[model samples]
Target chain A: MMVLVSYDVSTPGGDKRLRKVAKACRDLGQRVQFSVFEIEVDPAQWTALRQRLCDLIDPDIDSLRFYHLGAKWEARVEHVGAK
Target chain B: MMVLVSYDVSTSSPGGDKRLRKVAKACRDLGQRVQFSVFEIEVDPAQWTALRQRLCDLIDPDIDSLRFYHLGAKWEARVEHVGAKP
Candidate 1:
């Protein structure tokens, strides 16, 4: 399945958390935007990635969103500009 | 229809910086900004086309990236979120 992951880490001095989340995303898939990533992962993989992110984020000041684009993600997404 | 618009506008120069503001404001008028660079919009076909064109004009194709994720007309069931809201 393909997942669209977007995060906002707004802790005071949150750069470290931001970097960790961004790196975790970069390792799994291509970044489609500055704060969003398009990743392809199996059921187990998605679960693992979600767990890691949940552990990394500070719920008090952070947010994580996952859009399950599924296998037909190509049809669900449209792109314009740049590579 | 519901669309999730996400963009990466390179702000390495003044031109890019201006485009970033324009693109963001354009999206803001159409929907809620779910993240720094993402919006969730509900619009009809005509509205979608107009918004798309507006953003296209605001972006520098060589350095900007824009994406629209279609979530159908009824998307409430398709979305779920936890933690802080943005």
Candidate 2:
């Protein structure tokens, strides 16, 4: 499965948590943009990642989005500019 | 169709910095921003091409990267949100 993970950490809080979140994502996926990652993982792996992220982010301030592309991500995406 | 657009704009130079706001503004005009640099947009083929061309024209390829994720017409099932709302 291919999942697109996008996040925004609240700015007023210090940068440490932001780095922590980014590092957590970097360990699991390739970053396609500064705060967006394209992760290829199985069902179990996806569940684990979700748990890890849920623990890492502050739900009241940060935002997290997951776009599940299933097995058809390649056919469902288009790109322009830097690869 | 529903599409997700994400971008990374280099902030180290003048042209790159200016294009950041320009690109973002163009996206905001067409869709709802779901993150600082990500937007969820719905459009037909014509509008898609026009928006894509407009954004391509606004960005500096040397220092920027743009992505478009086509989520087809049934995006609600494909997208999951957690935490703070956009």
Candidate 3:
């Protein structure tokens, strides 16, 4: 299972907050883009990552958007078989 | 202007159909792979490409997925500037 998580940070300290979230999950998976990260976990890590992301949210300024990319979607993935 | 349009073809000849649509719209704007084939277009080009994609839908098997990326998004884009950079 692959997940594509992305967000927009337009506030004063939004960029810093976003980077913190990325750094926290750096070891979990590979970073796809500056703001987008991909993680392939065996259900456990997936839940952990999701909770971590939820914890990082500062709803007053930064907003988080994410999507669970199923295997059915046919987009050319970068790090295939990296797990 | 930019557009990222991607599709999947499970049926026989589905890939061909998707490629045809991509090639047809290739001339209009530059295509990169944010996920796979990210396109940057102006207001006019965006509209034209939208129509072109709509025309490519033959239904039943081929599936199309697209997203409109606003400028403020934090993702690092492939193409820095499409039209004219400051």
Candidate 4:
């Protein structure tokens, strides 16, 4: 039950929002990048994360969107290690 | 539980493997991005936060990549979005 979350945040506040979200999740799992993150938790924790994420947003200026990726609609595109 | 994970690195002695694997699990649990450096993970708040921080530290000067979306199958080349890809 993997999910993909995307946000088209305004440039000015995008970085700020990104940082805030990053900070909030610092104690949970492993942060992969400044904007990307990951975690391993059950359904209950998942719901909590979702609600917290939604709450972190300042909808008035930032636009947030998300989607879930199950076994059905999943694909992989690889970039060979270039030299 | 949503997860999206991606990696592209050539330096750092590969010590980041463990974190990378953990991040991958998050992606598997949620979702994943399969192109170049772009990725999308949909996990809970705690996991998302942890992964984000871990990624920040897993960087090497020799290699650099990213996890973001550009275009996919559902993308529309509508005139409004792209002024006709002549």
DockQ of each: 0.61, 0.68, 0.04, 0.03
Question: lDDT-based ranking, best first?
Answer: 2, 1, 3, 4
lDDT of 4 by residue, B1-86 (tens): 33333455444466545645554554554455432233456556686667666655554424544443222332221101101111
Name the candidate, 3 or 4, with the larger DockQ value. 3
Model 3 lDDT tens row, A1-83 = 66656544443776777788888778876665445565667688877877777777565544455445556433533221112
Global CA lDDT computed for model 3: 0.47
TM-score of candidate 4 to 2 decimals: 0.41
For model 4, residues A1-83, the per-residue Cα lDDT tens digits are 44444333443666777777777666654455434454444678767876777777666555444443334332432222222
lDDT tens digits, residues B13-53, model 2? 57765786787788776688877777888789889889999
Q: Global lDDT for candidate 2?
A: 0.79
Q: Candidate 2 residues A13-61, lDDT tens each?
A: 5267667777877767787776778888888998998888888888888
Best by lDDT: 2
Task: Flag the better candidate by lDDT, 2 or 4.
Answer: 2
Model no. 4, DockQ: 0.03
Models, CA RMSD each: 2.7, 2.3, 14.0, 13.6
Candidate 2, residue A5: CA error in Å? 0.2
Ranking by DockQ: 2, 1, 3, 4
